[PDB]
Structure formats: C-alpha cells, structure tokens
Design a protein around this ligand. Structure first.
Ligand SMILES: Clc1cccc(Cl)c1C1=NO[C@H]2[C@@H]3CC[C@@H](C3)[C@@H]12
Ligand SMILES: Clc1cccc(Cl)c1C1=NO[C@H]2[C@@H]3CC[C@@H](C3)[C@@H]12
Ligand SMILES: Clc1cccc(Cl)c1C1=NO[C@H]2[C@@H]3CC[C@@H](C3)[C@@H]12
Ligand SMILES: Clc1cccc(Cl)c1C1=NO[C@H]2[C@@H]3CC[C@@H](C3)[C@@H]12
Lengths: 454, 454, 454, 454
C-alpha cells in the first residue's frame, strides 16, 4: 500500500526516471493541446474571411440604397429623417436605386428571386385605421413592383395612391428585395466560388411617433449553389478535407475523457484501500477541468461539423464552445509546469487570501449595488454613462479601477444645479470610499500573511 | 441584569436557536429592502419613458426650426451665426417653418394656443435706445403673427419695418410659440395616450456683442387632458394602481421607524440599569442609518405621490431622495451579513487607519488647494481643463488617480513660451509630489498596523 | 538660557496658554493668506472677462475673413489651400469681406486708422528675384488699398498686375488692417465701456514650398480711449479702487517679510548663546518659504499695479508670480496645522525614504533618457507621440504612470514591418522594466522602514 | 596576488586617490557617450527635415489628384467609391489634374521623365478574360498618354474604348506618372537645393469584389542631381563635413571595443592566478553590454555613412541600430553612478525577486494566452479591439495595466445576445483574475523579502 501511495503521488518524469514508466498520457495531452489550438486558428481564419465578405457587401448595400448615407451608422439604425419630403425622398431613392442596380453596382451583383421565384420589389406600410379619430388595430397592405413596372418610361408606381402616407398614423414602411452575389476573390485559389443570396429589408420605422423616423437596413446572407456560373477552376472538397481533422480532434479528446475518468476511479480505489489501513487529497481538481474541456471541445467540434455540412453562416455557439475549451486547455499547461514545485509561496497566499477577498467582495458588493441604483435613478436622464443599470455597473467598475473618471465628471449637464451638485458628491464619495476600502484591505491581507507563515 | 445584557448583544438567529424568539424585525427589514428596490425600479422605468419622449420631441423641434442644424448642440446653445444675413436667414427660416408645420412634421403635432387662447407667433426684440450715441435703458417691442398673417400670399411680416434690426444695438431676438403633441406609442397598451403641450422659445442672443450671436432652443413640456382625441381604448387608472404601492412602502418604513426608535429606547434603559450596577457601546450606529433611510424613503414617496397626483413632469428632488434611501438600505445589508464575525481584521484596520488617513487628507488637501489656485490663475486662459476652479479641482483629482495626464500635457498652447515652460514644471512637480506623499503614507500605515496588532 | 530655549521651541497657542503672549504673528499670517487668496480670485475673474472678449472677437474675425473656415484651427495655422485658384479665392475673399465690413459684422465693429492715421488695406508679397533661374535675395512690394479704391464699381485692384503671383517663387502674402471695437456688455454695470483696437494680419505662408500654403490669422488687441462714444453712464474709478487693495497686500507682506527676518535673527542670537554654554535645528525651513512667498507676492502685486496703470492686456509673468505665491502660502497652512504633532510617523518616512527615492530616480532616469532617445530616433517619423524629444518624454512618463498605452500601441504604422516589430519590443520592454523597477523599490522601502523604526 | 586582487576590485576614483592611476578609460567612456548622443541628435534632425518634406509633398499630391479627398486617409487606402460613375469620375479627374499640373500646383513641381525618358501618363487595367463565363487567367493592357494627346482640344483618350471597364470582371486600374520637385526651403542657408523625383502610382483596387473599390496613392521619392537649376548659392560639402564626425565615432568605439576586451582578458588571467592559489565574479556583465553597444554603434555608423554617400532616403535599420546603441550607452551611466554603493537594498531585491517574478510570469502567461485565443475566436467579428491575435494581446495587456476598460465594455455589439452575455463574463473574469493574481504575488514577494534579509 505504501509503495502504491508513493507511486500515485509521484510525477510522471520521475516515474520514468525511477520506474521507467513511459508517460504516454503526457504526450497525449500535449497532442490534444496542439490539435485544439490548430483547429481554433483554422476556424478563426475561415470565419474571418466569410464575415469580412458579408460585412463589406452590407456596407456597399447601405451606400447604394440609403439616401445621403454618411458611411457610419448613427446608432442601431443607419440614418434618420425629420421631414415628410425627406422620408419621401429616401423611399423613392431606394426604389430608384434598385431599378438601375446593374448600371450602378461595382461588384458581381444581380437580381434574386423571392419565395415564389419572381424578380421584384415588395413594399409594405402600416397604419392605424381612422375609424385625431384612430383605432388600436393596424392595417397592412403591400404592393409588388416588378422590374417591368419600374422600367416603364412613366414610373407609375410613384403616381399611385399607395404612396400617400398619412405620417400622423404611420407605423413603419418596409422595403424588401433579394440579391445574388458571387465572391470572385476565391477563384484565384482555383477553389470554385460560393454564390450568396442576400435578403435585404429597409425599414422606415416611426413607432416612437416623436417626429423622427429611423431607417434600419438588415442584410441576411446565406450560401447557395452556383447554378448560373462557368469558371475554369476545380470544385471544393476541403469540406471533407477538414471533416477528417475535426473527427481526429474528437477521437483524441474522447480518449483523454476516458483516460482521466479511469485515473479518477483508480484514485478512488486507492483511497478505499488507504481507508482500510487507517480504520479532496485524492481527486485532482486538474482532472475535472480536463474533463470539462474535453466535453466542450467535443460539443464544439460536433457543432462545427454540422455547420460545415449544412453550409451555415452563423458561428456563435460553436465559437464560444471552442474558445472556452482552448482557455481550459491552457490552464492545464499551468498545472503541468507547476510540477517544478518552485511555485509554493504564491499558491499558499492564493489559498490563504481567497476567503478574505471573498468576504471583502461580499461587503464591497452591497455598497456597489446601492451606488449603482442611486446613480441610475439620479444621473440616468443627465449622463450617457448612467442611462441604464448595466451601463452604470460598467462605469462604476471602471471608476473603481481608475478609468475615465475625468470624462465621468465632465459629461454631466449643468442645466440642473441640484443634479450637478449631487453628482459631484456622488462621484467624490464613491471614489474616495472604494480607495479607502481597498486601502484597509491590502494592509490587513499583509498583516495576516505574516501570522500564518511566520 | 447579566441575562438581559447577554440577550441584547445576542444575534437574532441565535436568539431563535436558543430562546426561540421569532425575528420578525429581520423579516420586516428584508421586506422593506425588497419594496424600496422595486419602487425605485418602477419609478426609473416610468421616468425613462417620459424623458425619452420629451428629448426626442426636442431634437425633432431643433431639426425643424433651426436653420442648418448639425444634429449636435455646439455647447449650451444649439447653433451660432457670424453674419447679419445669416441671422436674418435663421430668423426667417424659423418663422417660415412654423407656417407649414403641418406639411413638414412627421409626428402627431399640431398648433397650440397661447395664454389668451390664440394660435400665433410672437417675436420680441431688445435694443438700447439711440438717445455711437446709445443709453443703458433697453426698449422691448413685440408683434403677434397669426396663422392668417403668415398664410397671406404676400408674407407682409417680412416687409415690415419691425425686422430692420440694428445689430450694433441689438441685445436679443426671441421667438415663442405653442405646440400640442400626442404620443401614440402608448395606445398599443390600450392605455389612453396623454397629450403634451410644448412651449418653445428660440432666443437669438448677442448679449456678448463679440460678433457672434448664440441661438438657444428651449422646449418646456407639460401633460394636458386629451380633449381633442378619439381612440378605441381604455383610460388610465394606474395612477391609483401605484398610489397603493407607495402607501404600503410608507407604512412599512413608518413601522421600521418606530421599531428602531423603540429598540434605541430599550438600549438606553439597559444602560441605565447597567450603570446602577457599576456605581456608544449601546447605540447601534446601524440604527441611526436605518432611521435616516426611513425618513428619506418617506419623504421621497410623498414627493412621488404628489408628482403623480398633479401630473408633474419634473422628478429631481424625489429621485435624489429615493436613490439616497436605496443606497442607505443596501449598507444595512452589509451590517446584517457582517453578523458572520469572520470580517474582523478588515474592520480593525478600518478603525485604526481612519485617523491616520484623515490626518493625511488634511495635509494633502492644503497642497491640493494651492495647486488648484495656481493652475487656475496660470493655465486658465491656455488650457481647457483649467478654465474655472471646479474644472481645475476635477482635473487635479483625476491626475492624482492616474487619469488623462498625457492629454493634460498635450492640450496646452505653445504660443507662449513662458506659460508652456511653467506648465511642464507645474504638471511634473504635482504628479511627482502626490505620488511620493501617497508612497510615504502606505509604508507608514503598514509599519503601524504591525505595532497595533503584533 | 534654558527658559529662553523652552520658550523659542514652544507653540504660540501654548505661549498664550502659559505666558499669555498674544500671537499677533499668527493673526498677521492668517490675514495675509486671506488677502492673497482674495487678490488672486479678483485678478483671475478680471482676466477671464478680458481674455474671453478678445478670444470671441478673434473667432468672429476668423469666421468673417477666412474663406471656408470650419470653426476650428487646423493646427498652428487656421486653414490651408493646395491649389492656385484656391489661394486666389482666399485672398480676394478676404479683401472683399473688409470692404463690406459694415454690412456683414454683427458686433460694434468699425474701421481703424493705421500708423499714419489712414483707413485702408495693406497687402505685401515676397518673391525670390528671377535674376528655374532664381536668387537667394527676396523682393518686398506693398500696395495700399483705401476704402475709396475698393468702393469703385470696377474693383480695379483685382485687375492690377500686382496680384499676378508666381507661386513657384512666392514666399508669403500678408494682409494687414486695423479695426476698432467696443464691448457694450459692460455698459449694464454703468461702467463706461473700454474701446479696443484690433491689429489683424492674414499671412498666406508657403515658406515650405511643399505644395501647400498655410493661412495664419493673428489679432493683436489693445485698449484705447473711447473718444468716439456717447453713453448715459459713469466713468471708471475702479482702477484706484483696486489700487488701494494691492497696496495693502504689499504692506501686509512687507510686514511679514521683516517679522520673519527678525525671528531668524533672534534664533541666531539664541544659538550663539547656546554655543557659549556648550563650549539647522534653529533656522525654521518654514521661514525661508514664507520669505520667498512674500517676495513673490510683492513682485506680482507691483507687476499687477503697473499693468493696471498702463492699461496693458498681457498678464503672464504677474499671473505666474501670484500663483506661485499662493501655492507657497498654502504650504504654510500645512506647517501651522502640523502643530498638532499627531503627524509624526508620516514625516519620519518622508525623511527616511527621500534619499532612497532620490537614488532610485537617478538610476531610473538614465534608463528613461536612453529610452527617450531611442524612441525619438526610431518611432519619430511613424508615431505622432514620438515626433520630438519633449513629446517622447511626456509619452514615456504617461506610460510609466499607466496612461494611454493601448493608444500608443495602436497609433503605429504597419507600412514598415521592421519598425512595427521594433515598436512592440520597445513598448513591451519599457513597460515591463519600469513596472519591475517600481516593484523592487516598494519592497525595499518597506523592508528598510522596519529596520529604522523597529 | 592579494595586492592585484584588491587593485582589480578597486574603483578608478580611489585608484587615483591611492595609486595615482589616471582613469583614461573613464574619460574615453564619457567622450564616447557624448559623441554617440550628438551623432544621434544630428541624424534625427536631418531625417526629420527630409521626412517632413516628403510627407508634405505626398499630402499635396493626394489633395491634387484624388477626387473629393477629405484630408485624412480612410485607412490603408486614401479614399473609396461605391458606384461605377464615381469610379469613372475619380479616374478621369486624376487624368485631367495631371494635364493642367502647371496651372494648379502651388509648389516648384514639374513633369518628370519615365524609364525611357518620355513625359506621359501610363494607365493599366486587369480583367479576367470572359472565355458569368470567366477564367482564372488575367489580361493586362496599358496605354501611354503623352502630354500632346491630353492637350488635344478633343480629349480623345476619354472616348477611347480602352476606358469601357467591365467592373464585374475588373481587378484593378493603376495610373502611374513621374514628377520632379525642388525644395527651395534650403536655399536660404546658401546650401544648393537637392532635386527630388516622385514616382506616383494611383491604384483603383477592387480585388475584394465586395461592391467597393479602394483607392491607394503611393509616392516613392528619391534625390537626383539638379541639372535644370540656376541659383546664386554655394554647393554642398556637408557630406564630407559629417563624414569625418562619423569616422571619429567609429574610431572611439573601436578603441573602447579593444579596451574592454583587453580588460576581460586580464580578468581571466587573474582568475587563473587565483585558481592556482586555491588548488561570474570576474567577468563584469557591464563589459559585454559595452561591447554590444560598441558593435551596434559601429554598424549603425557604417550604415549611415553608406546612406549619406549614396544619397539614400530610407533610414530604418541604421536608426534602429543607433537607437539601441544609445540606450545601451545610457545603461552604462547607471553602472558608473552605482559606484557610490548606496544602492544596495534595491539591487538585492532585484536579484531575489527576479526568479519569483519569472516564475509568476510563466504561470500568468499561459492564462493570458488562453484568454487571448478565446477573445479572438469569440469577440473577433464583434469587437474592433479583438479583430486579430496581436490586437487581442495588446488589448489584454492594456486591460491588465488598467487602461481603456470602459471602452472595451462599450464597443461591443448587442445585436447578438449570446455574444454580448459572454463578453461580460469574459471581461469581468479576466480583470478580476489578474488583479487577484497580482494581489497574491505582492504579498508573497513581501513575506519572502523578510525571510531573506531578516
Ligand atoms: Cl473584482 C475588483 C477589481 C478591482 C477592484 C475591486 Cl473593488 C474589485 C471588486 N471587489 O469587490 C467587488 C465589488 C463588486 C464589483 C467590485 C466591487 C468588486
Ligand atoms: Cl480621496 C483621494 C483618492 C485618491 C488619492 C488621493 Cl491623494 C486622495 C486624497 N487624499 O487627500 C485628499 C486631498 C484632497 C483631494 C485629494 C487630495 C484627496
Ligand atoms: Cl516621478 C515618477 C512618478 C511615477 C513613476 C516614476 Cl518611475 C517616477 C520617476 N522616478 O524616477 C524618474 C525617472 C525620470 C521620470 C520617471 C523616470 C521618474
Ligand atoms: Cl509584464 C506585466 C506588467 C503588468 C502586469 C502584468 Cl500581469 C505583467 C505580466 N506578468 O506576467 C505576464 C503575462 C504575459 C503578459 C502579462 C501577462 C505579463
């Protein structure tokens, strides 16, 4: 039993130095680290290319169809108008741009079919029925504008009574159309280009009824088969090319999953044997982390394989899984390196101070929450950094860590002398209090780290 | 007496564990915390909606009536002109916009009556009477421009001699009108919309006589009864809906007010009994804080009820009261949590260091004040962060805490070599001195925290 | 002798408590502090008003005379042009603005006479004589354009051969004129307004010969007697009103100068008497500071009196003197407050650590200088924060104190891979090294502060 | 042997104080420091002048030839267009500007000859041959436009079929021309001006095929003999003027190279003699640094001499060498100053803490790398500070040092609720973890610095 206990606590390198036991587990771990990092890098590069293409196309569309587009979104919406003729001009400009799409576009862009396979432009409007007499119910009417209708020498659609919008009753006007684009940037690699279908919606939203309508542009994009295309170049097989690399990563992490599970079981067996002799110290906390990382890697690889198989363009859950898995993989490198045993005093303090810091954070947290609520309720309407609770929390965290305090002082509005005076008291007290609380903490931590060690 | 003293110092949880005394006071406190937080959140959301509507309407008005409005206020004033024809253009543009208000506005906006119930536009001008011969007295003359006068094919008002402004004598020109607006964004909730009355004043202020006039736009808004309105929807009763919740909050805090007062009296009775036996340690400093929070909550709730009853749109004192009350409520959570007694070393340092830090702040404060005065007097005309004493104080506080020093160095003007050289000496000495003073402080605090504990 | 020594070391408050000696010196010091602070505040407010008026007039002039002025100076120069017709347009626009000055200006502005008392416009140009054949010598020719010449229906001046500028030889074109302005903002206070004379020069400088000319606008302003003015209002006597307050400040500081000098002499007498008994500890270092502050205050008050007497508009040396004097006055408040004697441990560390910090700064300074030189020589042409040595020093100081490091990393140009790679090594090494050096310092300071006290 | 050992450990000043040995080595070192610093300053000033001239000319060219140039590069490219007619307008505007170059330019600029000595304009275009039928191969065709062709009353070139660009197949359009410029700013110093030849290329690059073409402007400049120039002024000899100063610097550092090498050999001889008596402490680590600095200075001086001899305009390797040499020279000043021996406690900690900090950095580095990878993979497409791995590393380093955290929180896109929630967890955990790890480090360092010294 004593021989087994010494062997289980022994480091693999010294296991080979004394017992000549080959540490295949360490090599498997290193291989897993390398494969996970390589897979993450490849996935990141591919996503970078696809996302860059889609965002560039969206920017080009915004420049083409939005009237007087500056080049930067004013907020969550691209642009806004404040006058009836301005809104009319924006709508008519968007419609007229779509008609000459061929003469204007600089890229490989063409007209796309709708759900019922028809090239055209659909515009819908919403109003409260008059029945300022109005009713809560809304009316929705849409008109389909084909390319033939827009091509007519007399536009006609413009003279239609459909466009007489009663802005006082208007809710929103939405313009939707489909476009097909091909990225020739990939043809150089002899890799057959992948056609894209863009579903664009322009929403002239005035739901607020505050005298200003907001123009939203959304461009949903997806990959489609390049039926209408003829290039001297090879097709794509890289799908199956990467399909084996992902499978190998799954197998390697699956092996590491069982291997760590078997080691935990053997540890439990030894503790039972030790307990019989003597009728937390046996469960490595670095094995459960490895198990979690393996599970996350397997899930992320499965999601990536599913995304690649179905030619999906959304990689948010898979990316999160892969990133967390890689982070956990690198903390295991810390574990292995620490085998040197020249890391002790630091580890000790990290265990001694953890309860004290956790107690301090619980106390400081209640002051922080109250300050958050007070700041949001008082400086909410007068400060841009205090508009909502989450923003208040982030601003207070930054202030606690020494960031952007002068901007916080400056961006207040002196239009209200009562609020301005309170803000100075609010900001000065908060910064002074948390500096002092962090002061009283370090000194205590130090005084106690001497009692425990000396 | 000894039994009573042990009971008064005993924690409520252990009181129930040993004496089986139900801690209804703790439950009442928790209930009060929950109600106060909920009330604050509801008030904040309602104020957010109302303030957002009013600010959006103000922005729309600024875009409509101010000529060549960029979209952002140049300062406390919205825009400014430097030429006589520019000022004439701005005034005439504002007047002409008001005439076609219906054809231009995108929201539910209509003309409003003035004090004497008349739809029109009033413009007033101020001049020093010539009597560069001029006098200190000013003359004020106003002309009322009805919609009929503006509707005339020949404007007329423009050809009037009233508009011949002698800019060399001009003080200001003010344009005032009334508008009525309805927010239909609330009709979806079946809640009858609340009509708004906007009092707008456009001031072309050239009081400085510095070759530049400043254009101010102010939009005072208030809620009015929707007489001219017909919507299939229910009226509002939420007034009385919230009127009971505020009353319950008042009752709960009123109960906590007497309960803490009774506890203090009982503590005083026990100290008198203790003093008779033995012919600060008895007044919880966490009871006076609770009493203050209760008073602030009661005052804020009364103010909120008054504001809701009279349909007022200004919530600055009530918001301050509620925020401070919530902050004080959350420090009581610290008090209760601290019952664990595993918080000691920190509390000790916080009492030992308080006199030392207060002494240090008194010394550092006198250097800080002198540096503030010197910076304001020297770098006042050459630095934007040193224009006035309050700004100097805020800038120096930020510099003491490591914020925006490079910007402070850069935003000086090298047009004066004497001031530029002084600023480098001023900034370098200030930062170095306060770093050293904070250095000499931490080391002292630490050396003494050992003498007191060890 | 022992009685005298105890008396000289005794605090004034205890002197009155025991010997009943009235501390008139302390009262005189407090009075001096109050008077100095009040004088500084008054001077600052007056300078603020005058400077604000002059800067507003300069901004108005820039808007009036500079063609296409944005509202903010592009650098040390207001605007710039890159095309010959643009330069011609700017020059002609400036000249034409001056002609209609009356119809355009919004302030009380009129034409001013030149040195020889003549209303007109002088424009000078510089060229290298052709003698690309050219010579180092320059030619200067100027033409005077009176208001009569500009008023002519056919401008004429424009058709003159004087304006045929050979840009390839041009050095600069300068336009100078005089204007007279009155600030009526002061007439409200019944204080007679002070007339101003503006000397404006517009320089079209192309000295660099780099394809871009820089347009400089300078507006020298000075106060003149309001001969052409008639307002129902009183004249100014506040000159003599403040002339007594400054005289009283001089007398008070003169008294404090001799009083501290007499105290030092008495201290020297006591040390000589002490030395005879026993055949730095006697010279308060808080008396030489008071003497320096008194001298600075006297000099600043004399300069302020001279400036007020001669109606000067430049207050840079006097402001510096007054600010430094006020700063030194407030450090004496620290001295007096410290009489409490509860400040000891801090003072001790401040004396123990001073040699150690001075030694550390000498070492860190040599690394800092070398890093400054390397950064200026390498990242000089590729980084805006490393253009010149002073900017490099300020940037490195800010980096040492944790400020704007991410901006420092980002604002480099990747056009050169060699410089970009070096910058990462340069920035990473500098930040890491100085963090470690400050680390090794605090620990040493602390270890030694124990040896000296314990 | 004991006498020799005491002499070798003895400081030069005390060597002269006792043995009267003149420290010519110290004087040689000081001379070397002075010469190196002077050479660096001179080189920096000359490079500043040349670089400023070239950059100003490039800015002028961008303003002249790029249509609608704002004044600041939108990125790595100067400007961009999104419409076919916009691209046509930009190309035609560039060509038309070149034709009237003389009437437009404000500087001494003239037409330059191409490789075959011909004044003209070359424009090349790239397309995939149609053979959306297209092929991977590209076609390149160029047309030479002489000044005579552009001068024709009927432009002609514009009506040519060459300009019919099929944007759907276009790769890029490049316009190249040569210009000759002279800087007359130097003629004042009587120093003959140096003529410059500018090779400018305008690239209308649409390689991305994303609906937006990017316009690149590159201006390669080099010095040429001023054949076409006649100024009354002297030629340049400063080449040989500085050629001796650089030679002297080389000789001085060459002498210091052998002198330090000889000292090391003598140290090795003494250690061998010491070893025979007793049958790291002898190799100054401040001699190898001096040797490295000498080698770097010699290499940099040789490179500078080569650059000056061949009139080259690129100074990036030489500048790096000189800067590193100067930095190493200033660390030797630290070495000499340290002879005072009042620097001990600091040096001690710097040796005691180095292993502990190196161990801590190895551990913190693995967490930092994992966080870098996770941030790049997750927040890559949604945050501008996480676009690529290097940017992620710089952002995380800045966050570790307290910089721009609030901006990091704010610049995320809430369009994805999953990514937004992860970012808050990602940022909060990273900042909290590294603060705690740095916390647990300082306390450990301090506890151990007591064990080693006390
Ligand atoms: Cl994580 C951290 C980093 C830097 C400084 C501080 Cl004060 C902290 C905190 N310790 O306690 C909590 C309390 C809740 C967010 C703050 C306040 C947090
Ligand atoms: Cl609150 C604080 C936070 C961070 C750093 C410092 Cl130095 C302080 C201060 N301690 O003393 C006072 C003195 C008056 C405002 C400054 C200077 C203040
Ligand atoms: Cl003043 C100061 C404040 C904060 C941090 C530091 Cl490192 C310092 C310095 N101590 O040494 C000198 C050296 C010369 C300017 C820096 C480097 C200065
Ligand atoms: Cl250099 C430094 C300065 C300030 C704060 C810290 Cl945490 C450091 C580091 N110590 O460990 C490494 C790890 C790799 C870059 C960071 C993380 C670095």
């Amino acid at each position: 039993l004593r021989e087994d206990l010494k062997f289980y606590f022994m480091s693999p390198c010294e296991k080979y130095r004394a017992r000549r036991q080959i540490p295949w587990k360490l090599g498997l771990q290193i291989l897993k680290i390398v494969m996970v990092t390589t897979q993450l890098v490849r996935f990141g590069l591919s996503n970078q290319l696809v996302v860059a293409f889609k965002e560039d196309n969206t920017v080009a569309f915004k420049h083409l169809f939005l009237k007087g587009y500056s080049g930067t979104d004013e907020d969550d919406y691209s642009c806004s108008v404040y006058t009836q003729e301005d809104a009319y001009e924006s709508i008519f400009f968007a419609i007229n741009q779509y008609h000459q799409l061929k003469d204007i576009t600089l890229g490989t862009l063409g007209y796309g079919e709708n759900e019922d396979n028809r090239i055209g432009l659909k515009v819908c409007k919403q109003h409260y029925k008059k029945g300022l007499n109005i009713d809560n119910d809304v009316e929705l009417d849409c008109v389909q504008l084909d390319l033939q209708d827009l091509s007519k020498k007399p536009p006609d659609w413009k003279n239609s009574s459909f466009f007489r919008l009663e802005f006082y009753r208007l809710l929103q006007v939405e313009i939707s159309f489909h476009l097909k684009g091909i990225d020739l940037q990939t043809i150089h690699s002899r890799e057959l280009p992948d056609c894209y279908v863009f579903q664009n919606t322009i929403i002239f939203d005035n739901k607020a009824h505050s005298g200003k309508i907001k123009i939203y542009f959304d461009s949903d994009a997806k990959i489609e088969e390049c039926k209408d295309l003829n290039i001297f170049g090879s097709t794509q097989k890289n799908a199956q090319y990467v399909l084996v690399f992902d499978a190998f990563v799954i197998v390697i992490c699956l092996a590491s999953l069982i291997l760590c599970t078997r080691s935990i079981v053997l540890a439990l067996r030894l503790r039972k044997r030790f307990l019989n002799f003597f009728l937390w110290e046996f469960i490595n906390g670095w094995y459960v982390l490895v198990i979690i990382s393996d599970l996350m890697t397997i899930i992320g690889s499965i999601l990536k394989m599913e995304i690649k198989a179905k030619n999906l363009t959304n990689y948010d859950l898979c990316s999160i899984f892969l990133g967390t898995s890689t982070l956990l993989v690198w903390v295991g490198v810390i574990r292995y390196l620490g085998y040197f045993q020249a890391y002790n005093v630091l580890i000790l303090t990290m265990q001694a101070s953890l309860p004290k810091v956790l107690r301090f954070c619980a106390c400081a947290g209640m002051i922080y929450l109250g300050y958050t609520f007070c700041g949001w309720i008082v400086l909410g309407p007068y400060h841009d950094k205090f508009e909502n609770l989450n923003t208040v929390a982030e601003c207070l965290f930054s202030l606690v860590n020494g960031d952007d305090m002068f901007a916080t002082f400056a961006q207040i509005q002196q239009k209200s002398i009562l609020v301005w005076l309170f803000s100075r008291l609010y900001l000065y007290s908060f910064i002074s209090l948390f500096i002092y609380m962090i002061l009283s903490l370090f000194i205590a931590l130090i005084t106690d780290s001497y009692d425990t060690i000396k």
